[PDB]
Amino acid sequence: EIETFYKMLTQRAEIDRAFEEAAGSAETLSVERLVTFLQHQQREEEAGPALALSLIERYEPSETAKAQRQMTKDGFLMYLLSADGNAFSLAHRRVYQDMDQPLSHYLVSSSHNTYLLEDQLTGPSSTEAYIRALCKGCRCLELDCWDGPNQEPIIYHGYTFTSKILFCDVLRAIRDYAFKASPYPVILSLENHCSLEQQRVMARHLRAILGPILLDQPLDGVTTSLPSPEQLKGKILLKGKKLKLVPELSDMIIYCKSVHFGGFSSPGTSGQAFYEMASFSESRALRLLQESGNGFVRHNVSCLSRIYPAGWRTDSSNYSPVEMWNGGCQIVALNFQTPGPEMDVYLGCFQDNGGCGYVLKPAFLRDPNTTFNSRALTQGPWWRPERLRVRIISGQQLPKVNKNKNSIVDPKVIVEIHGVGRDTGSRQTAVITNNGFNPRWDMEFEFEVTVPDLALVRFMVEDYDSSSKNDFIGQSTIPWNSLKQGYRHVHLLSKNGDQHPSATLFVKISIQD
């Protein structure tokens, strides 16, 4: 009763149902049975007793069954809720890719007016903002340098009422956090509006503060291509205009000389040096992608492109990064302060590869001769249609999203596919009235994804409201290739990207060519 209660408040048929099918009539899961489950349902590659044991040794609560190499319903569950049963591939949650290719081969985690905490017009600026981004994995940061009093350069949003901060104060912060989240290179995109004197001051602060972390001299060799994230480990590079501009600073720009976009070389041999990087607004970028998709792509193979939000985004809202990534753009800057699907997607992408901040682009986007163009799809390696079926079974302990009262959520789930325009899709379950503890949907959806190497799957849970707009409850974005198959739990994050302790979705995923 009070036994039954807890034993009832804690009673997940879907789980039972699942154990049964795998366990058949037995009360436990023998290795043999477990392995079968891993192989047939969880579609594991390394499927084999070796793994089956690891799971048991890891997750089986019972000493008997543990010792006897068996799994109980409980252990089944524990596994299912563990990092091993996460829909986001536990293997992808550690640097596991080739970190030896030129920077231009990786998508880099970048931010826009990083010093900013809110809007672009009158919001506050803060070192905290750089700390948060760095903590969220960001690698490329933006500093808007302006002359300040007492000959101390400051950082704020030029021509607006945004709060100010000190360039040096910011450098220290960057100094301390640059590598907390990753050992990979950090790029400082300087936007210099400083008098030559103050520029000299900056240069000093840079060396004085960054000291040996600061990369102020080209790498030995590193002649025809940008160095790789590896060769640049634990270093901080500068990006800006290179010779109004004092040599002290200018001399510091080595691999990221800020340039005005010329055009895409194609109608010739070159255009921009590998060490030249152009920036494009969200608008201009779309244009070039619309007209010269392959143009860009091929360009982005050996060069780094930066893209930032359209000027009308004074609310610091963000655009969809996918569109840019689809063009091979690597430094897609967003307002990291952002809650919203855009950052949700952005941070899900970068969750991959151990969250080191550098994610290797697909091969076709690393092929200088590619004929790819996400806007004009033709047969090619990138073309690999797949069938995705996601069953939204139930949800567990959905967080009571900020209701100024004692009402119960009326959850519903949205599953979206982000990728090339053609693959983009979205579907939703029905609403479950007044249930956040254990809503049960048991609904399934199917998607056809033609260019999976560019897709991401997003799970979003909303608190339905007849009247007003539904409250966001939680979300999770998994890159296509990190999407684990079978029975898994989706671990929901807050709008701030925070991990909700017991908030999950239990789903069943299958991907078939």
Ligand X SMILES: O=P(O)(O)O[C@H]1[C@@H](O)[C@H](O)[C@@H](OP(=O)(O)O)[C@H](OP(=O)(O)O)[C@H]1O
| Residues at the contact surface with Ca ion, assessed by CB under 5 A | 113, 144, 191, 407-408, 410, 434
Cβ contact 109:138 at 8 Å: yes
Query: Cβ 170 to ligand X, closest distance in Å?
Result: 15
Q: Give 323's DSSP letter.
A: H
Position 306 contacts ligand X (CB under 6 A): yes
- Measured from the CB atom, is 142 or 410 closer to ligand X? 142
On whether 142 is known to bind a ligand per the annotation, the reply is yes
Q: Of 395, 397, 396, 433, which Cα lies nearest the Cα of 414?
A: 395
Structure tokens at 199: 């520029």
Position 337 contacts ligand X (CB under 6 A): no
Query: Cβ 408 to Ca ion, closest distance in Å?
Result: 5
On whether 434 is known to bind a ligand per the annotation, the reply is yes
Position 119 contacts ligand X (CB under 6 A): no
- Measured from the CB atom, is 86 or 162 closer to ligand X? 162
Give the list of residues 6+ apart from residue 118 with CB closer than 8 angstroms, or none.
124, 316, 337
Cα–Cα dist 308/280, whole Å = 7
Near ligand X by CB under 6 A: residue from 308, 447, 459, 506: 308
Cα–Cα dist 472/451, whole Å = 29
Per-residue x/- marks for ligand X, 189-208, CB under 6 A? Answer: x-x-----------------
Position 79 contacts ligand X (CB under 6 A): no
On whether 128 is known to bind a ligand per the annotation, the reply is no
On whether 57 is known to bind a ligand per the annotation, the reply is no
Q: Of 508, 382, 392, which Cα lies nearest the Cα of 449?
A: 382
- Measured from the CB atom, is 142 or 323 closer to ligand X? 142
Query: Cβ 138 to ligand X, closest distance in Å?
Result: 14
Q: Of 459, 349, 481, which Cα lies nearest the Cα of 413?
A: 459
3-state helix/strand/coil string of 471-491: EEEEEEEEEHHHECCEEEEEE
Near ligand X by CB under 6 A: residue from 89, 113, 126, 292: 113
Cβ contact 101:361 at 8 Å: no
In the list Ca ion, ligand X, none, the entry touching 434 (Cβ below 5 to 8 angstroms by class) is Ca ion
- Measured from the CB atom, is 299 or 491 closer to ligand X? 299
- Measured from the CB atom, is 18 or 143 closer to ligand X? 143
Query: Cβ 306 to Ca ion, closest distance in Å?
Result: 11
On whether 465 is known to bind a ligand per the annotation, the reply is yes
Paired with 331 in beta bridges are 306
In the list Ca ion, ligand X, none, the entry touching 342 (Cβ below 5 to 8 angstroms by class) is none
Cα–Cα dist 508/391, whole Å = 5
Q: Of 401, 366, 478, which Cα lies nearest the Cα of 88?
A: 478
Helix (H) or strand (E) holding 458: strand 456-463
491 a catalytic residue:
no
Query: Cβ 160 to Ca ion, closest distance in Å?
Result: 11
Near ligand X by CB under 6 A: residue from 60, 84, 119, 142: 142
Position 279 contacts ligand X (CB under 6 A): yes
Q: Of 356, 286, 353, which Cα lies nearest the Cα of 326?
A: 286
Structure tokens at 512: 């078939």
Query: Cβ 120 to ligand X, closest distance in Å?
Result: 7
On whether 513 is known to bind a ligand per the annotation, the reply is no
Position 416 contacts ligand X (CB under 6 A): no
Cα–Cα dist 505/513, whole Å = 25
On whether 1 is known to bind a ligand per the annotation, the reply is yes
On whether 239 is known to bind a ligand per the annotation, the reply is yes
Q: Of 358, 104, 365, which Cα lies nearest the Cα of 224?
A: 104
260 a catalytic residue:
no
Cα–Cα dist 508/486, whole Å = 5
In the list Ca ion, ligand X, none, the entry touching 508 (Cβ below 5 to 8 angstroms by class) is none
State phi, psi for 361 to the nearest 5 degrees.
-70, 160
Active-site position among 157, 299, 418, 491: 157
Catalytic positions? 112, 157
Q: By CB under 6 A, name the binding residues for ligand X.
A: 112-113, 142, 144, 157, 189, 191, 258, 279, 306, 308
